Amino acid sequence: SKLIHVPKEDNSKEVTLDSLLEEGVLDKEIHKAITRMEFPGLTPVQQKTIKPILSSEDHDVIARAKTGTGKTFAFLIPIFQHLINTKFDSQYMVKAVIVAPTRDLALQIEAEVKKIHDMNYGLKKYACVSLVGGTDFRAAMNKMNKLRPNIVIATPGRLIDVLEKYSNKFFRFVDYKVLDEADRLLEIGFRDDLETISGILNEKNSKSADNIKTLLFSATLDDKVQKLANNIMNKKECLFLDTVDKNEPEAHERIDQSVVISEKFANSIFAAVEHIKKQIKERDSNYKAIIFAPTVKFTSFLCSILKNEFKKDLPILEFHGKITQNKRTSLVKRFKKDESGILVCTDVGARGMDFPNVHEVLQIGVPSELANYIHRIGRTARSGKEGSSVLFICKDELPFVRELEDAKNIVIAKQEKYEPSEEIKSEVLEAVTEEPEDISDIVISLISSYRSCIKEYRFSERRILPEIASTYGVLLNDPQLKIPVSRRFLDKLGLSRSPIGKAMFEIR
RNA sequence: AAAAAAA
Ligand SMILES: Nc1nc2c(ncn2[C@@H]2O[C@H](COP(=O)(O)OP(=O)(O)O)[C@@H](O)[C@H]2O)c(=O)[nH]1
Ligand code: BEF
Ligand SMILES: [Mg+2]
């Protein structure tokens, strides 16, 4: 497979819905649906991609647009059009398969399809079904039989389950497959799954094993994705669409980024509380923000702190992989609607999730992966609206910020140091209603988390892991105290041979 | 222990 590049262009010709109703690209049924939405016009990415996504194969696509540019519709418009173009063939078969890295994002994409339906009841005939984990498998199949969807949105796990069972029944006539947040879906832990999905869909296609057309979408990707997606793309040639300069930062321009650096990792906690407290007062509780954290246990803990002194002011929402899928969905629908509130989450909500009018994005610690910094702050400043972001870290996480300049050319201007007063520390710590053995588990999680991204972020192992583990002493208000561990555990950790192990743990 | 992702 060979790639071709069509970069950004400022003095490009304007494309519009009326212009696509002319030229015979889009049917009138779709033209209505999007016009009803009262958008001033198609976003840059949407204008550039609706064709040649519809154009004749062979021609796989790869789009590159910043966060909040409406990439969803940018591949949802052509799919509906193709479904209209092929109305009288395989009308009871899946023709488009969309894959997303998280359940909530897959459900979001489904909702966006269902919005298009709401804007034009004539499009409802092209049914849609979400195939996701944490939902009733049987009920999903019953819905699969009842509606006979032309569009399937799914997450890799559940999708392989149904394909191994019912690929002959629904998926023998797929023409399009979409990888939303493509780069993540092509990373280790997802790549094998998507190769299994692609292989099954290609193997069972009625016409040709190279029939399916693959679309890759994300706000962060390079030329290395074509190399990494060579096994899932059938067409002889693939054209790369791009609405951001190669040198320009992948992050969104309208985001006012800032860094709050501290001595200790635990210091970032107090800094975040004070920053929120200022914001609530300064905005008169008219504050909608998302706070990211490294681990599930630390999110739950951070959520407990925020509830203890902001629940009076704002709603505090806990969102992570260990939340039941019913609560996750119910939580997502609320925060989408609410004008205010604090969403405390892991990287489940780093990518794709569209929460209207988020004022700020806060971060305690580093993200799961380098690229996810761009996606994290991308939760705000969406669809024209403005926004800012704050990154809370200690003086041992600067290599992450420097790596941000080396790799993704993400330079950040506003930076300031922070030191916690004795007053704020007493307030927070006195409000913690958690046993030392619970504090233990939380701190170990962070050690495990930061141990996992040492190489990627160019950290100094001998410095960070002690500092991370040291938070256990801070929370119990006894700095020199070390977290008690078993000889079998410390050995099981592998740090038994390291001098760093003694600097982190006390074998009790 | 460790972010997602089928029971
Ligand atoms: N103003 C405007 N907003 C749009 C347009 N297309 C989509 N949106 C909005 O942009 C928001 C987020 O878009 P999204 O699909 O998440 O963009 P993505 O992050 O690149 O995938 C949605 O809530 C849409 O309502 C458009 O053409 N104009
Ligand atoms: F780029 Be993501 F879909 F906001
Ligand atoms: Mg998106």
XYZ file of C-alpha atoms (C1' of nucleotides) and ligand atoms in Angstrom:
548
model
C 0.000 0.000 0.000
C 1.187 3.518 -0.884
C 0.159 6.781 0.787
C -0.472 10.225 -0.723
C -0.591 13.535 1.159
C -2.952 16.497 0.699
C -1.917 19.068 3.368
C -3.719 22.128 4.738
C -4.753 25.129 2.630
C -5.891 28.604 3.695
C -7.190 30.057 0.418
C -9.199 26.920 -0.357
C -12.616 27.030 -2.026
C -15.596 27.064 0.335
C -17.671 23.877 0.491
C -21.263 23.917 1.745
C -24.376 21.757 2.088
C -26.041 23.567 -0.811
C -22.893 22.952 -2.856
C -23.058 19.227 -2.122
C -26.784 19.140 -2.848
C -25.618 20.555 -6.146
C -22.941 18.476 -7.926
C -24.977 15.416 -6.875
C -22.851 14.282 -3.925
C -25.486 14.440 -1.174
C -29.145 13.447 -1.402
C -31.801 15.918 -0.230
C -32.654 13.633 2.699
C -29.257 14.293 4.296
C -29.091 17.955 3.276
C -32.143 18.654 5.413
C -30.903 16.732 8.466
C -27.727 18.797 8.943
C -29.239 22.154 7.941
C -31.816 21.702 10.714
C -28.943 21.641 13.219
C -28.467 25.357 12.563
C -24.680 25.123 12.269
C -23.231 28.206 10.516
C -21.559 25.819 8.071
C -19.379 22.730 7.692
C -16.199 22.671 9.766
C -12.827 22.551 7.936
C -12.473 18.777 8.348
C -16.048 18.092 7.213
C -15.678 20.094 3.998
C -12.436 18.326 3.125
C -13.493 14.715 3.723
C -17.159 14.112 2.775
C -15.537 13.668 -0.596
C -13.555 11.558 -1.512
C -14.913 9.302 1.253
C -17.820 8.909 -1.165
C -15.468 8.815 -4.155
C -14.826 5.473 -5.843
C -12.360 2.954 -4.436
C -9.609 2.094 -4.225
C -9.032 5.005 -1.840
C -8.753 4.544 1.926
C -8.743 7.787 3.932
C -6.823 9.232 6.874
C -8.069 12.501 8.387
C -6.282 14.776 10.857
C -8.307 17.458 12.631
C -7.884 19.099 16.036
C -10.198 18.322 18.954
C -13.756 19.622 18.587
C -13.755 20.154 14.819
C -16.706 17.805 14.292
C -14.847 14.723 13.058
C -17.864 12.608 14.015
C -20.139 14.042 11.319
C -17.074 14.232 9.075
C -17.530 10.459 8.604
C -21.198 10.198 9.591
C -22.414 12.242 6.599
C -20.836 10.039 3.894
C -22.012 6.818 5.545
C -25.643 7.938 5.466
C -25.161 8.988 1.836
C -23.716 5.601 0.879
C -26.666 3.947 2.615
C -29.004 5.996 0.422
C -26.995 5.229 -2.727
C -27.371 1.517 -1.964
C -30.905 1.551 -0.546
C -32.238 -1.390 -2.585
C -29.281 -3.734 -1.984
C -28.736 -5.611 1.288
C -31.172 -3.309 3.091
C -31.210 -5.660 6.102
C -27.413 -5.965 6.391
C -24.666 -4.027 8.172
C -22.859 -1.793 5.677
C -20.833 0.416 8.020
C -18.886 -0.587 11.135
C -17.550 2.111 13.480
C -15.041 1.201 16.206
C -14.148 3.273 19.285
C -11.633 2.737 22.159
C -14.207 3.235 24.958
C -17.823 2.203 25.539
C -19.050 5.707 26.337
C -17.568 7.077 23.122
C -19.245 4.339 21.067
C -22.552 5.185 22.742
C -21.909 8.858 22.015
C -21.389 8.177 18.306
C -24.641 6.207 18.337
C -26.427 9.182 19.906
C -25.041 11.422 17.159
C -26.498 9.050 14.561
C -29.799 9.117 16.450
C -29.695 12.922 16.376
C -29.502 12.794 12.577
C -32.579 10.559 12.716
C -34.341 13.105 14.928
C -33.585 15.839 12.380
C -35.199 13.795 9.588
C -37.550 10.880 10.295
C -36.953 9.783 6.699
C -33.499 8.541 7.697
C -34.793 6.251 10.457
C -35.105 3.383 7.961
C -31.307 3.157 8.054
C -31.319 1.727 11.572
C -28.404 1.765 14.007
C -27.280 -0.552 16.810
C -24.510 -0.171 19.377
C -22.566 -3.299 20.319
C -20.736 -2.541 23.541
C -19.502 -4.181 26.728
C -21.384 -3.763 29.990
C -24.730 -4.276 28.264
C -27.056 -7.255 27.854
C -25.680 -9.421 25.045
C -29.040 -11.043 24.292
C -31.011 -7.788 24.200
C -28.446 -6.357 21.792
C -28.937 -9.316 19.446
C -32.721 -9.022 19.742
C -32.287 -5.399 18.704
C -29.988 -6.633 15.936
C -32.736 -8.880 14.555
C -35.605 -6.433 15.035
C -34.033 -3.431 13.297
C -31.568 -5.076 10.892
C -29.200 -2.079 11.192
C -27.134 -0.658 8.336
C -24.822 1.023 10.854
C -23.001 -0.637 13.743
C -20.975 1.267 16.329
C -18.930 -0.828 18.717
C -15.941 -1.294 20.981
C -13.441 -4.006 19.942
C -14.202 -6.536 22.699
C -17.960 -6.966 22.285
C -17.654 -6.679 18.499
C -15.397 -9.743 18.282
C -17.881 -11.682 20.430
C -20.776 -11.101 18.017
C -18.601 -11.569 14.926
C -17.398 -14.977 16.107
C -21.081 -15.953 16.363
C -23.157 -13.999 13.823
C -20.788 -12.687 11.132
C -22.633 -14.610 8.398
C -25.994 -13.178 9.453
C -25.231 -9.438 9.392
C -21.686 -8.598 8.321
C -21.250 -10.254 4.913
C -21.964 -6.982 3.084
C -19.883 -4.369 4.915
C -18.529 -1.595 2.673
C -17.073 0.825 5.238
C -15.228 0.396 8.515
C -14.213 3.381 10.641
C -11.524 3.602 13.311
C -12.366 6.610 15.461
C -9.414 7.644 17.623
C -7.435 5.509 15.177
C -3.975 5.956 16.711
C -5.148 4.572 20.061
C -6.935 1.676 18.351
C -3.642 0.798 16.631
C -1.565 0.786 19.823
C -0.604 -2.445 21.588
C -3.529 -4.079 23.381
C -5.954 -2.984 20.658
C -4.033 -3.699 17.447
C -4.433 -7.486 17.574
C -8.163 -7.085 18.237
C -8.696 -4.771 15.277
C -6.669 -7.108 13.056
C -9.008 -9.908 14.110
C -12.068 -7.764 13.359
C -10.698 -6.603 10.004
C -9.692 -10.136 9.047
C -13.138 -11.542 9.796
C -14.947 -8.758 7.923
C -12.660 -9.153 4.898
C -12.825 -12.955 4.964
C -16.644 -12.997 5.008
C -17.301 -10.211 2.489
C -19.550 -11.485 -0.319
C -17.871 -9.520 -3.115
C -14.139 -9.195 -2.421
C -11.659 -9.632 0.425
C -10.427 -6.125 -0.427
C -13.907 -4.627 -0.797
C -14.097 -2.842 2.561
C -13.049 0.809 2.677
C -11.191 1.913 5.822
C -11.413 5.383 7.368
C -8.999 6.482 10.110
C -9.798 9.535 12.255
C -7.990 11.213 15.163
C -6.593 14.508 16.452
C -3.159 12.923 16.887
C -1.430 10.903 14.173
C 1.522 10.964 11.771
C 2.826 8.954 8.796
C 3.652 6.093 11.166
C -0.023 5.082 11.385
C -0.094 3.930 7.760
C 2.851 1.678 8.584
C 0.980 0.452 11.659
C -2.348 0.006 9.835
C -1.000 -1.707 6.717
C -2.648 -4.973 7.785
C -6.190 -3.546 7.974
C -6.270 -1.379 4.831
C -7.204 -3.150 1.606
C -7.021 -0.449 -1.065
C -3.873 -0.040 -3.158
C -3.543 3.644 -2.268
C -4.543 5.789 0.716
C -4.879 9.574 0.753
C -4.058 11.549 3.898
C -6.397 14.440 4.693
C -5.076 17.105 7.061
C -6.386 20.402 8.467
C -3.355 21.274 10.593
C 0.165 22.233 9.507
C 2.799 19.518 9.934
C 4.899 21.831 12.106
C 1.954 23.278 14.041
C 1.028 21.725 17.411
C -1.706 19.082 17.350
C -3.291 20.799 20.358
C -6.101 23.311 19.855
C -5.052 26.961 19.596
C -7.938 28.388 21.622
C -6.898 26.527 24.786
C -5.155 28.730 27.358
C -2.766 26.161 28.820
C -0.912 26.588 32.114
C 1.360 24.586 34.427
C 1.280 24.507 38.225
C 4.504 22.874 39.401
C 5.201 21.864 43.003
C 7.877 20.346 45.225
C 6.018 17.131 46.039
C 3.391 15.122 44.157
C 0.949 15.439 47.060
C 1.316 19.213 46.731
C -0.533 19.115 43.406
C -3.571 17.877 45.324
C -3.775 20.974 47.526
C -3.028 23.210 44.539
C -5.985 21.759 42.633
C -8.355 22.249 45.567
C -7.325 25.890 45.956
C -7.599 26.494 42.210
C -11.123 25.061 42.143
C -12.051 27.019 45.275
C -10.949 30.241 43.577
C -12.859 29.289 40.440
C -16.112 28.533 42.282
C -15.954 31.875 44.094
C -14.739 33.787 41.043
C -17.428 32.292 38.777
C -20.121 32.247 41.486
C -20.427 28.446 41.312
C -21.054 28.737 37.560
C -18.217 26.304 36.932
C -18.040 23.211 34.731
C -14.712 21.378 34.792
C -13.107 17.982 34.215
C -10.345 16.692 36.503
C -8.099 13.885 35.228
C -6.078 11.566 37.472
C -3.642 8.666 36.875
C -5.469 5.699 38.477
C -8.931 4.421 39.381
C -8.215 4.255 43.122
C -6.760 7.765 43.099
C -9.765 9.115 41.187
C -12.099 7.628 43.783
C -9.912 9.178 46.481
C -9.682 12.546 44.730
C -13.455 12.417 44.292
C -13.911 11.856 48.027
C -11.836 14.948 48.818
C -13.755 17.130 46.367
C -17.104 15.924 47.707
C -16.070 16.893 51.244
C -15.750 20.623 50.475
C -17.375 21.287 47.072
C -20.452 19.034 47.136
C -22.105 21.921 48.969
C -21.292 24.084 45.951
C -21.200 21.849 42.863
C -22.123 18.304 41.801
C -19.138 15.922 41.971
C -19.141 13.065 39.448
C -16.961 9.924 39.601
C -16.224 8.369 36.201
C -13.924 5.391 35.560
C -13.722 1.802 34.328
C -14.828 0.314 37.651
C -18.103 2.261 37.569
C -20.992 0.067 36.400
C -21.811 0.714 32.750
C -25.346 1.820 33.640
C -23.971 4.481 35.989
C -21.307 5.491 33.458
C -23.944 6.162 30.790
C -26.270 7.868 33.274
C -23.323 9.968 34.444
C -22.343 10.953 30.897
C -25.863 12.040 29.954
C -26.114 14.289 33.025
C -22.748 16.034 32.677
C -23.577 16.637 29.016
C -26.704 18.547 30.057
C -25.659 20.222 33.316
C -24.346 23.786 33.180
C -22.028 23.162 36.128
C -20.325 20.381 38.075
C -16.987 18.622 38.470
C -16.248 15.474 36.483
C -13.484 13.458 38.170
C -12.260 10.728 35.820
C -9.499 8.475 34.519
C -8.508 8.351 30.844
C -11.841 6.708 29.988
C -12.975 10.242 29.182
C -9.722 11.503 27.700
C -10.727 10.845 24.077
C -13.775 11.724 22.012
C -16.254 12.488 24.795
C -18.143 15.662 23.936
C -19.309 17.640 26.961
C -20.745 21.026 25.915
C -19.221 24.163 27.437
C -16.536 22.762 29.728
C -14.777 25.812 31.159
C -11.554 24.167 32.303
C -9.637 20.896 32.152
C -7.590 20.098 35.253
C -4.873 17.440 35.513
C -3.318 15.955 38.632
C -0.296 14.045 37.347
C 0.589 12.760 33.885
C -1.745 11.070 31.365
C -1.808 7.386 30.394
C 0.083 8.162 27.187
C 1.895 11.158 25.688
C -0.769 11.833 23.048
C -3.561 11.769 25.636
C -2.406 15.133 26.973
C -3.657 16.658 23.726
C -6.923 14.741 24.012
C -7.371 15.586 27.702
C -7.294 19.368 27.257
C -9.405 18.815 24.139
C -12.439 18.129 26.323
C -12.813 21.910 26.581
C -12.700 24.561 23.849
C -14.987 22.549 21.553
C -17.245 23.670 18.701
C -16.070 27.285 18.665
C -16.494 27.802 22.413
C -13.473 28.981 24.414
C -11.605 27.213 27.216
C -8.436 26.772 29.263
C -6.482 23.980 30.970
C -4.284 23.509 34.037
C -1.690 20.782 34.603
C -0.747 20.059 38.228
C 2.558 18.232 38.744
C 5.654 18.087 40.949
C 9.288 18.939 40.198
C 9.976 15.343 39.125
C 7.539 15.340 36.197
C 9.184 18.069 34.104
C 10.684 15.525 31.667
C 7.079 14.930 30.592
C 6.672 18.633 29.811
C 10.006 18.742 27.981
C 9.107 15.589 26.051
C 5.935 17.456 25.106
C 8.131 20.007 23.318
C 10.432 17.468 21.661
C 7.806 15.111 20.244
C 4.577 17.040 19.648
C 6.067 20.555 19.612
C 3.682 21.479 22.434
C 5.261 24.519 24.083
C 3.458 25.923 27.119
C 3.857 29.538 28.223
C 2.165 30.046 31.587
C 4.090 28.296 34.364
C 4.253 28.906 38.116
C 5.464 27.184 41.285
C 3.208 26.197 44.187
C 3.760 25.491 47.879
C 0.924 24.373 50.181
C 0.204 26.439 53.291
C -0.277 24.614 56.593
C -3.900 25.769 56.635
C -5.035 24.135 53.385
C -3.210 20.903 54.228
C -4.974 20.613 57.583
C -8.377 21.173 55.966
C -7.943 18.493 53.299
C -6.218 15.893 55.483
C -8.700 16.341 58.340
C -11.541 15.671 55.895
C -10.088 12.338 54.743
C -12.207 9.538 56.225
C -10.048 6.685 54.934
C -8.006 4.116 56.858
C -4.209 3.929 56.418
C -4.681 0.573 54.685
C -6.873 2.292 52.093
C -4.330 5.091 51.702
C -1.855 2.262 51.137
C -3.697 0.841 48.103
C -4.104 4.308 46.572
C -0.390 5.106 46.771
C 0.658 1.709 45.406
C -1.589 2.366 42.392
C 0.309 5.570 41.620
C 3.654 3.814 42.040
C 2.432 1.193 39.568
C 1.143 3.909 37.242
C 4.315 6.004 37.234
C 6.483 2.885 37.084
C 4.742 2.090 33.788
C 5.618 5.314 31.927
C 9.195 5.979 33.069
C 10.801 5.267 29.685
C 8.114 6.957 27.580
C 8.315 10.237 29.519
C 12.088 10.056 30.095
C 11.707 10.147 33.884
C 14.437 9.464 36.427
C 13.318 6.287 38.206
C 15.535 6.916 41.236
C 13.719 10.203 41.911
C 10.035 9.847 40.981
C 9.103 6.513 42.580
C 10.379 7.627 45.994
C 8.541 10.940 45.575
C 5.329 9.194 44.502
C 5.522 6.698 47.374
C 6.261 9.598 49.732
C 2.664 10.813 49.336
C 1.691 8.053 51.767
C 3.568 9.940 54.474
C 1.983 13.250 53.516
C -1.591 11.951 53.705
C -1.013 10.398 57.135
C 0.748 13.652 58.068
C 4.011 11.830 58.813
C 6.541 12.506 55.985
C 9.314 10.204 57.246
C 6.844 7.333 57.633
C 7.062 4.634 54.952
C 4.247 2.456 53.623
C 4.287 -0.962 55.372
C 4.897 -3.911 53.020
C 5.439 -7.685 53.202
C 8.781 -9.268 52.279
C 6.958 -11.395 49.702
C 5.271 -8.306 48.248
C 8.402 -6.157 47.945
C 10.063 -9.136 46.280
C 6.974 -9.690 44.125
C 7.290 -6.027 43.144
C 10.780 -6.777 41.840
C 12.180 -3.679 43.539
C 13.812 -5.894 46.179
C 17.088 -5.687 44.252
C 16.805 -1.909 43.887
C 18.133 0.621 46.421
C 14.991 2.565 45.509
C 12.835 -0.106 47.141
C 14.200 0.736 50.582
C 13.554 4.430 49.920
C 9.861 3.722 49.281
C 8.844 0.881 51.589
C 9.249 -0.352 55.163
C 9.173 -4.141 55.424
C 6.820 -4.690 58.371
C -0.567 -3.186 42.232
C -1.100 -0.500 37.164
C -5.454 3.217 31.778
C -8.765 1.053 28.295
C -11.010 -3.139 26.095
C -16.015 -9.620 25.334
C -18.900 -13.187 30.429
N -20.385 25.088 14.939
C -20.323 23.819 14.471
N -20.331 22.801 15.369
C -20.271 21.511 14.962
C -20.198 21.232 13.523
N -20.149 19.892 13.400
C -20.184 19.357 14.651
N -20.269 20.330 15.582
C -20.323 20.176 17.062
O -19.040 19.843 17.597
C -19.218 19.107 18.809
C -18.115 18.076 18.978
O -17.731 17.578 17.698
P -16.917 16.193 17.600
O -17.608 15.239 16.657
O -16.732 15.572 18.963
O -15.508 16.660 16.985
P -14.201 15.739 17.149
O -13.605 15.943 18.521
O -13.191 16.146 16.106
O -14.581 14.288 16.972
C -20.585 18.448 18.724
O -21.315 18.667 19.936
C -21.272 19.072 17.521
O -22.553 19.606 17.870
C -20.196 22.397 12.605
O -20.133 22.237 11.367
N -20.257 23.625 13.138
F -10.750 14.678 18.725
Be -11.804 14.200 19.731
F -12.957 13.401 19.045
F -12.445 15.412 20.448
Mg -14.136 12.458 17.783
